[PDB]
């Protein structure tokens, strides 16, 4: 139903 993968990625965690 939803896509939140970018927001829980290792990349996001680094910001």
């Amino acid at each position: 139903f939803e896509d939140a993968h970018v927001e829980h990625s290792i990349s996001r965690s680094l910001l």
Partner: antibody
Framework: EVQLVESGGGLVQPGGSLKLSCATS????????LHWVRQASGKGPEWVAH??????????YYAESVKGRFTISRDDSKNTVYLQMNSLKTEDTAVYYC??????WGQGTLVTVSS | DVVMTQSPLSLPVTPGEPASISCRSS???????????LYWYLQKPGQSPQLLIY???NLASGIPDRFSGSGSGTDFTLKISRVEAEDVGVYYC?????????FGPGTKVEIKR
């Protein structure tokens, strides 16, 4: 620097068990979603399992071919994610990757299921 | 399920010319928030898959802007404006929306000579 390091692969007999581990470092672990993805030689990637974070009550999701046999789990205090594999079949033979599914993928660990 | 398909299976490209490969999903990958859950990867032998384009059209960091992605609903296209040598490998599309998450079968891009 970001590191995802799989281990635990090897040769195992059909119907046997194996636990894969994925040790990680270099990034805050608590709110990162993680996956296991596998790949047999000459074939494309196949998603295996997905585990969310404590905030998400560690919800888990599984590929049709592994339901009831594999368990994905994580230990936030050790920045490690795991894949427990029971009742293994020859068709489970593959390289197993841990990854956030996006920019970061480990090097993979090879699992061979055979007598 | 959602099944992902791709064409062609193989694509020889003369260096410096464009490449275009297609992907299709069996249902729409638009989410309620306008995001399209479609992702493109390049995989070279012995390496893990490399993300090139995320959510249909966004270039991943460090990826040359020779790569671009577009789509209309269920049909998606990856383009390389001019092929360079490091571009060879197998290109996969994938959807991360409907929970049996799935990858396409791959398109092998080779250098024509």
């Amino acid at each position: 620097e970001v590191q995802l390091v799989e281990s635990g692969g090897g040769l195992v007999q059909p119907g046997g068990s194996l636990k894969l581990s994925c040790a990680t470092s270099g990034f805050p672990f608590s709110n990162v979603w993680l996956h296991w993805v596998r790949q047999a030689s000459g074939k494309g990637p196949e998603w295996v399992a997905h585990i969310k974070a404590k905030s998400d009550n560690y919800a888990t999701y599984y590929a049709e071919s592994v339901k009831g046999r594999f368990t994905i789990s994580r230990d936030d205090s050790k920045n490690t994610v795991y894949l427990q594999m029971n009742s293994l079949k020859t068709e489970d033979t593959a390289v197993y990757y841990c990854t956030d599914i996006l920019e970061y993928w480990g090097q993979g660990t090879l699992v061979t299921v055979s007598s | 399920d959602v099944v992902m398909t791709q064409s062609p299976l193989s694509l020889p490209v003369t260096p410096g010319e464009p490449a275009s490969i297609s992907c299709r999903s069996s249902r729409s990958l638009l989410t309620s928030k306008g995001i399209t859950s479609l992702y493109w990867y390049l995989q070279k032998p012995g390496q893990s898959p490399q993300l090139l384009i995320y959510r249909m059209s966004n270039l991943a960091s460090g990826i040359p802007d020779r790569f671009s992605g577009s789509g209309s609903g269920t049909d998606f296209t990856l383009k390389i404006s001019r092929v360079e040598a490091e571009d060879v490998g197998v290109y996969y599309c994938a959807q991360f929306l409907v929970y049996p998450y799935t990858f396409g079968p791959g398109t092998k891009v080779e250098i024509k000579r």
